[PDB]
Amino acid sequence: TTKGVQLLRGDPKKAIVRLSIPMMIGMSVQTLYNLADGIWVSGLGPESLAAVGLFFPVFMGIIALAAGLGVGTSSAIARRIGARDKEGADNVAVHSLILSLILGVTITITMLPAIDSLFRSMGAKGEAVELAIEYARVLLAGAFIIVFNNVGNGILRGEGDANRAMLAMVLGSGLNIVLDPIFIYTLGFGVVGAAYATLLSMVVTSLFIAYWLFVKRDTYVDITLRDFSPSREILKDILRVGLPSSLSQLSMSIAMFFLNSVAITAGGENGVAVFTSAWRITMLGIVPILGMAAATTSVTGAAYGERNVEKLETAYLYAIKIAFMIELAVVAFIMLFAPQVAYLFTYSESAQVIKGDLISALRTLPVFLVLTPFGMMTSAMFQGIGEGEKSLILTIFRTLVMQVGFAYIFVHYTTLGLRGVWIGIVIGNMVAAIVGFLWGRMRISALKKT
């Protein structure tokens, strides 16, 4: 019926490529927003920078919940479109929007009365805390807008419409890029201006999504209350992927906070700065993997809805092969142009001291990017078949047990310093990727048996 549905129901390799690319583009613009924003805020001085840092974990928590619900929505929709179960996909989509309201507004009313004492309960004091509270208040006010935007994106990706999913990301992040200097500097609102810029850009994104869903009504799925039937099976289907997805993203954040502590132990404050920089650069080259993982979930889901294991395996292994080849080019570039990249991320007189260490990190750490596709696409298809708990276990094994465990081991038992941290992270990721790939094969051979 729609071009996206025909993509999903067609050749898996074409769908994989045509769904992943617009997702990579969308995530690249989001990445550009964050980098630009970091530049604006850094020129406001330490108080504003500390206010943002204070609020960082709460913000990541909100994103984890919003994105989690979006992934469970996308997977459930994709599977029912595969089964030619149209009324099921309609009902999943409606259940997801009601869930967006419940989750989004719950976040707002739970965190609004808690935020003043919460940020005071930390060690910090003075202006930075006051700014952090005001900053958080603005974003918590749009918690529903955030969740709704992620659920809408999931509905689009769920029905093979990555182009509009991309567009909404581009619109939101692009608008935030325009509003940032206007709100912070031109209107003189300072750091809280960035919060308002974001809130406004999220609201506008909401309008486009709502317009498509409720006015144009040109999606494959139909969203009406008349054909909404309260279903505990649908709720459980969405949450079996969504909730473990949120926990995975939190396992990621928890690992970063642990690795911060490992980095300060190995190289001091400046070593934390090296880790933070090298990690941002590394997470740049992981963007195509995320885009290809989002596509895998949709195509493996639809293939699983068709009860077509051959199509599922083809999509899965092809995503790995392509992600692998991209990462090779990505890793080669980073290791080759390490000094040039390190220049751009040490763009100040004060960050000049950590440049040499950043180069070494860039000639060691990014190597794991080439093994990541084996574990990530495996996690992606676990979500496609609805088994989120398997994806959670695999991600906990990679981020917490293997990444942090091996980094901690090198710092405790050796004198390698920061180099041991990178090597520990690479070894940790290598192991998990192999374990993940083999678990994936087991699960697939079982699928053929059933």
Partner 1 sequence: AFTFRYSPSLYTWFLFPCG
Ligand X SMILES: CCCCCCCC/C=C\CCCCCCCC(=O)OC[C@H](O)CO
Name where the chain breaks: residue before each gap, C-N > 2.5 Å: none
* 349 Cβ contact partners less than 8 Å away, ≥ 6 residues apart: none
Site string for partner 1, 106-145 (x = CB under 8 A): ----------------xxx---x-----------------
Q: Of 98 and 118, which has the nearer Cβ to ligand X? A: 98
Which of partner 1, ligand X, none interacts with 63 (beta carbon under 5 to 8 A by kind)? none
Q: Of 22 and 142, which has the nearer Cβ to ligand X? A: 142
Which of ligand X, partner 1, none interacts with 247 (beta carbon under 5 to 8 A by kind)? none
Contact 249, 63 (CB under 8 A): yes
Q: Of 124 and 351, which has the nearer Cβ to partner 1? A: 124
What's the CA gap between 202 and 169, in Å, rounded?
10
Shortest CB 95 distance to ligand X, Å: 5
- Closest-CA residue to 95 (of 229, 213, 216, 226): 229
Contact 199, 179 (CB under 8 A): no
Q: Of 75 and 176, which has the nearer Cβ to ligand X? A: 75
Reduce the DSSP state of residue 217 to 3 states and report it: coil
Among 211, 214, 257, 347, binds partner 1 (CB under 8 A): 257
Under the criterion CB under 8 A, does residue 62 sit at the interface with partner 1? no
Helix (H) or strand (E) holding 349: none
Nearest 10 degrees: CA dihedral of 253, 23, 324, 345?
A: -60
Under the criterion CB under 8 A, does residue 58 sit at the interface with partner 1? no
Which of partner 1, ligand X, none interacts with 347 (beta carbon under 5 to 8 A by kind)? none
Shortest CB 410 distance to partner 1, Å: 16
Which of partner 1, ligand X, none interacts with 79 (beta carbon under 5 to 8 A by kind)? none
Shortest CB 233 distance to ligand X, Å: 11
- Closest-CA residue to 293 (of 212, 220, 366, 395): 395
What's the CA gap between 222 and 301, in Å, rounded?
20
Among 24, 25, 54, 354, binds partner 1 (CB under 8 A): 54
Under the criterion CB under 8 A, does residue 34 sit at the interface with partner 1? no
Q: What is the DSSP code string of 86-116?
A: HHHHHHHHHHHHHHHHHHHHHHHHHHTTTHH
Residues in contact with ligand X by CB under 6 A are: 95, 98-99, 102, 106, 109-110, 230, 235
What's the CA gap between 160 and 3, in Å, rounded?
8
What's the CA gap between 25 and 77, in Å, rounded?
23
Q: Of 56 and 337, which has the nearer Cβ to partner 1? A: 56
Q: Of 118 and 203, which has the nearer Cβ to partner 1? A: 118
Q: Which residues sit at the interface with partner 1, rule CB under 8 A?
A: 46, 49-50, 52-54, 56-57, 122-124, 128, 254, 257-258, 260-261, 264, 269, 272-273, 276
